[PDB]
Amino acid sequence: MNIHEWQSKQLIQKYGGRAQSGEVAFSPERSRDIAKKLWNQFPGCEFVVKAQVLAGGRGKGHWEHGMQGGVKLAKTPEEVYEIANEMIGHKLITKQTGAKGINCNKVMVCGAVDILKEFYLSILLDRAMGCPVIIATSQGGMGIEEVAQKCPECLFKVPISVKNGPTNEQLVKLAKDLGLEGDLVQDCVDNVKALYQVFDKCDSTMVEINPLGVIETPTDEKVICCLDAKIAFD
Amino acid sequence: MNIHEWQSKQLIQKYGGRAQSGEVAFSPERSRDIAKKLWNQFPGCEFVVKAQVLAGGRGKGHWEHGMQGGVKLAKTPEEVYEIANEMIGHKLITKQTGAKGINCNKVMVCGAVDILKEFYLSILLAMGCPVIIATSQGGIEEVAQKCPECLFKVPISVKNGPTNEQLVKLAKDLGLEGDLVQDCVDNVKALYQVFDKCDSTMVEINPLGVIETPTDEKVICCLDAKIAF
Numbered sequence: 001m002n003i004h005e006w007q008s009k010q011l012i013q014k015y016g017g018r019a020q021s022g023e024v025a026f027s028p029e030r031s032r033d034i035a036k037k038l039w040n041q042f043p044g045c046e047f048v049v050k051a052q053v054l055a056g057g058r059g060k061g062h063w064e065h066g067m068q069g070g071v072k073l074a075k076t077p078e079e080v081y082e083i084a085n086e087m088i089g090h091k092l093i094t095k096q097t098g099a100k101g102i103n104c105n106k107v108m109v110c111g112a113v114d115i116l117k118e119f120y121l122s123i124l125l126d127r128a129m130g131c132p133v134i135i136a137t138s139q140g141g142m143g144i145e146e147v148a149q150k151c152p153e154c155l156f157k158v159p160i161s162v163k164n165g166p167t168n169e170q171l172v173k174l175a176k177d178l179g180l181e182g183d184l185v186q187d188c189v190d191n192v193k194a195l196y197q198v199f200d201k202c203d204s205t206m207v208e209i210n211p212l213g214v215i216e217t218p219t220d221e222k223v224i225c226c227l228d229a230k231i232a233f234d
Numbered sequence: 235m236n237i238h239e240w241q242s243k244q245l246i247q248k249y250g251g252r253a254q255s256g257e258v259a260f261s262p263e264r265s266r267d268i269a270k271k272l273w274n275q276f277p278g279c280e281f282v283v284k285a286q287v288l289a290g291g292r293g294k295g296h297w298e299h300g301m302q303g304g305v306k307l308a309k310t311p312e313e314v315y316e317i318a319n320e321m322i323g324h325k326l327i328t329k330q331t332g333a334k335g336i337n338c339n340k341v342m343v344c345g346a347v348d349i350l351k352e353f354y355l356s357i358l359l360a361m362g363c364p365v366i367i368a369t370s371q372g373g374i375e376e377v378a379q380k381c382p383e384c385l386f387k388v389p390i391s392v393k394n395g396p397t398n399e400q401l402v403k404l405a406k407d408l409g410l411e412g413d414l415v416q417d418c419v420d421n422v423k424a425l426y427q428v429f430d431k432c433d434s435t436m437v438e439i440n441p442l443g444v445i446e447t448p449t450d451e452k453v454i455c456c457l458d459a460k461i462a463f
Contacts, residue, residue, distance in 0.1 A: 045276075223278035
């Protein structure tokens with residue numbers, strides 16, 4: 001059982017992680033109102049509209065009536081309305097849904113940010129090692145099976161002492177192994193600790209962040225941020 | 235009678251102007267909630283907390299208990315709480331208030347943005363017709379009053395409103411180039427509709443800014459606003 005992206009992100013934020021949870025909208029008009037209000041705060045910003053569906057391959061999918069993408073860029077609140085109008089109440093077809101598609105009745109409206117780096121990061125129980133593991137790659141936005149098959153050099157698998165860890169030294173090395181320098185190293189450490197707390201304290205079978213991003217803030221600071229999130233339960 | 239900065243900006247927005255009206259808060263707790271919610275949209279952003287008081291010289295002013303400034307940068311929602319807590323329910327002393335100061339009962343919280351240019355622009359009604367005054371200089375409203383020669387002044391045919399040629403020339407005279415010229419033209423046309431359709435004696439934008447959006451586009455934006463009736 002998976003929860004939606006915006007709910008996963010809110011849970012991450014609850015445990016001190018940085019995530020772009022945006023605001024959920026149950027109508028196209030509400031989607032526009034969210035965008036309009038955000039222009040009170042960051043005037044002239046752009047928007048991303050993300051269909052909230054329980055299925056994978058959302059961003060790459062296409063709608064039954066022809067629109068391309070479950071994640072779309074919008075320049076104005078009216079463009080946000082137009083996009084949400086083709087998502088809410090309609091069927092999204094992804095690789096994982098097959099031709100049957102999946103109904104969408106809500107979207108997330110987000111501010112558009114400069115994304116500098118995309119990582120993959122997941123926490124799950126590893127059968128072989130008999131403990132939780134952190135799996136991460138510097139090649140976010142890809143099938144994790146493809147990375148292991150075609151690019152095993154950028155994949156990292158970190159065993160975690162179930163409630164005797166993860167240790168700070170493991171997280172610093174992972175962050176540095178992902179190519180992070182400067183303040184982003186500690187930022188990454190802090191965010192991965194929060195993700196583990198979500199995994200542990202919420203009895204999740206998998207916390208998957210694809211992508212875990214390095215983004216720029218509106219005043220150009222570089223920060224770690226969950227840009228998609230999938231949390232699974234039993 | 236003047237309306238507050240954030241109300242002035244909301245009125246400008248209603249007529250299609252770009253303005254950082256932020257969100258008003260009447261308690262430090264609400265201020266913090268506003269900030270926390272904004273981190274859902276622009277994670278990691280910084281915040282500006284602006285005392286909403288009907289008095290000038292806020293930025294240089296100081297509060298009784300030591301805090302410097304009516305306009306303050308906050309890095310987190312908790313700094314937003316702390317700053318707002320020193321503003322709301324307290325007295326701000328600026329050169330315009332005198333020692334008697336002015337009570338603050340509200341702040342505006344807005345996202346911190348990179349400001350690339352600050353202009354002064356005002357639309358005023360005195361005994362003749364509307365006039366648009368502006369200068370390319372950045373405490374600039376007193377510079378306007380004691381050095382009026384530093385101002386562009388553009389008379390407006392009340393029957394025909396500002397012409398497009400006047401505003402393009404004004405924007406270019408203020409040093410704007412490229413797409414910012416038309417953006418400025420569009421925003422000043424909105425400020426005129428507020429001035430006209432709301433029977434205002436003054437719409438004062440100090441500063442009218444060039445700011446960067448979160449994805450680094452440059453846009454014209456009202457960063458302060460004072461509207462009189």
